[PDB]
Amino acid sequence: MQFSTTPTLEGLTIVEYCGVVTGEAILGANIFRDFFAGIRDIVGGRSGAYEKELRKAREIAFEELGSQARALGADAVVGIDIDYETVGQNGSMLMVSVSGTAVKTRRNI
Amino acid sequence: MQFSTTPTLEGLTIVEYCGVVTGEAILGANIFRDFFAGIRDIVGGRSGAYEKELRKAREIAFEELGSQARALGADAVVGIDIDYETVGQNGSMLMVSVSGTAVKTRRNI
Amino acid sequence: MQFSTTPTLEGLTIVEYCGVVTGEAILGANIFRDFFAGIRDIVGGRSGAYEKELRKAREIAFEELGSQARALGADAVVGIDIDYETVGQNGSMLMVSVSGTAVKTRRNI
Amino acid sequence: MQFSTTPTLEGLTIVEYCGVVTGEAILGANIFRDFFAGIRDIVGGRSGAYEKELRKAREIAFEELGSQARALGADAVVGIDIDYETVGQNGSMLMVSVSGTAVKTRRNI
Amino acid sequence: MQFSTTPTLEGLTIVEYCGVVTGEAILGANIFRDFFAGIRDIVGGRSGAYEKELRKAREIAFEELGSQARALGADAVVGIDIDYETVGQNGSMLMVSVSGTAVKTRRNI
């Protein structure tokens, strides 16, 4: 079971299209205040307290994506897009949403 | 009726492009207040109350996009994109927007 | 004039790439107050008054997009993206932007 | 210099991929208050004066994008994305971001 | 290594897909106040002081994307997307996110 942002997989052929699947996670305001609010200058994943939160949010979004694909009998999700959207009163909640297309594949050889 | 984030469907060829179609749904601030605002820590679709609502907004949006396609004489919507946009003063309304290209397909066999 | 969110059109060949074209429309705060504010629960574009306004805005944006393409001598716009952006001091203005690539095509037959 | 939102150019072959390039421009609050804040109803870019400002913004973004590509030795930018983000305390600044992949091409004839 | 917003690389064949990779950087409120908040009129990356900041954030994100791909055995990241999201209480923080699909490639010659 592979995940790709590309619409096809070289070396394989998609033998069935099983629909659009989705995963998501929301980081609560508390996580934003604790790890994001204090950021000074430009801070990348490697150094920052926030990256472990984003990563957890991604990891959860992807598992939901994969499990939805699993339930359809798909073995890949292609054409994947990941979006981040700020939600809530204080612009302090974060939604990570993944979407792609569940597919059955066959090796070309 | 097939929906894909990919621009083509292997196994088929598109014989008509019938134009860009859309669907959307808006979750009002009452929904946001009730299911989204109290979120603590990181909450994925599995555990959280909000997920029922997102899902219902998505299905409704796809239904609208599906009806637009079907009305046009199309049998697939390809090159699909789903966007989420918060709107309104309090950032407490959520818009789910879907778009794609309605197409007529013919099987390669 | 054909519009597609796919980068190519099966059955035709792109003979000329004529550049990136765009179209937009902005729905003012008065539209938002009148049609979007205080939407309650989850409302789809099918039953919602707001959709008449969104449909109008997308219509106008595509006209502009179609009109830019025409002036370059194109007969299609491919690889189209549509996004919605909330703008302004009160998050009560919506901008719809379309973009894509103006192209000249030749039917394979 | 050719600009496209599609990944390939029909009629050409990409012989070298030279990396991701970007360009951008920010529209200040003053321009926003002058051209965007007063909009009533639905105004399209064809008649709306704000559109002169957006097109100036995009043009600057594409200038940067193409000059970046020029320096890498490229002759096209493919797989282009255009994005708008509202930024600042009053949702009254607008950033136009463009990205794509700089490439050398070879005409098939 | 090779970064592309295209899903394939003409002249090469993708021999393995190694999963979706991400990188990101956050620009803190202080950078925003010092470089973005004062902008007047329309200011492009070529001339704006904000540009070295965005450039720096992009570089950190791509580095993270880069090493993530390396750790998986990959020699290229294709299907790349860059998104900018304004986050926080005062719309004065900016997240730059990059995602793509890590791959192994083989020269066709």
Side-chain angles (χ1 to χ4, degrees), chain B residues 29-101:
Chain B
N30 63 316
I31 298 308
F32 202 88
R33 228 138 51 224
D34 292 0
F35 306 93
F36 287 74
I39 282 159
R40 113 192 61 70
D41 306 309
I42 305 169
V43 180
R46 272 169 199 68
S47 309
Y50 76 79
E51 180 55 34
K52 194 191 189 230
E53 316 296 326
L54 275 196
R55 185 156 190 228
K56 170 121 223 72
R58 263 191 322 272
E59 302 176 318
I60 287 179
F62 275 105
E63 208 281 314
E64 181 182 9
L65 171 95
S67 89
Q68 278 194 206
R70 158 193 344 127
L72 283 177
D75 56 69
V77 185
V78 300
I80 287 180
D81 179 61
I82 306 150
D83 301 316
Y84 298 91
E85 296 81 37
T86 50
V87 300
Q89 301 212 216
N90 309 122
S92 282
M93 292 178 280
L94 200 161
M95 180 162 60
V96 185
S97 304
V98 67
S99 60
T101 301

Side-chain angles (χ1 to χ4, degrees), chain A:
Chain A
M1 154 99 244
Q2 61 219 302
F3 296 103
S4 183
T5 60
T6 63
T8 57
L9 307 166
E10 301 201 271
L12 336 183
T13 306
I14 288 146
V15 294
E16 215 184 323
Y17 290 86
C18 320
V20 184
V21 281
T22 286
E24 72 249 321
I26 282 156
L27 294 69
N30 74 301
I31 297 302
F32 199 87
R33 297 194 293 271
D34 289 336
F35 312 96
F36 288 76
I39 286 154
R40 176 179 291 105
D41 298 319
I42 305 171
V43 177
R46 268 97 113 229
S47 311
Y50 77 86
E51 183 57 63
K52 130 202 175 245
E53 310 309 308
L54 276 179
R55 170 164 16 102
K56 180 128 177 272
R58 266 187 309 273
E59 173 192 40
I60 281 148
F62 272 102
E63 259 125 64
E64 182 176 358
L65 183 79
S67 131
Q68 236 170 250
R70 236 171 280 118
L72 295 155
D75 57 77
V77 181
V78 291
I80 289 166
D81 186 54
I82 322 169
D83 309 300
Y84 306 85
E85 188 81 24
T86 308
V87 302
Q89 285 254 200
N90 307 325
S92 286
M93 305 173 49
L94 223 186
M95 191 178 64
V96 183
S97 48
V98 62
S99 61
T101 298
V103 295
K104 264 94 124 107
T105 59
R106 176 194 60 224
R107 218 269 93 115
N108 280 164
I109 299 154

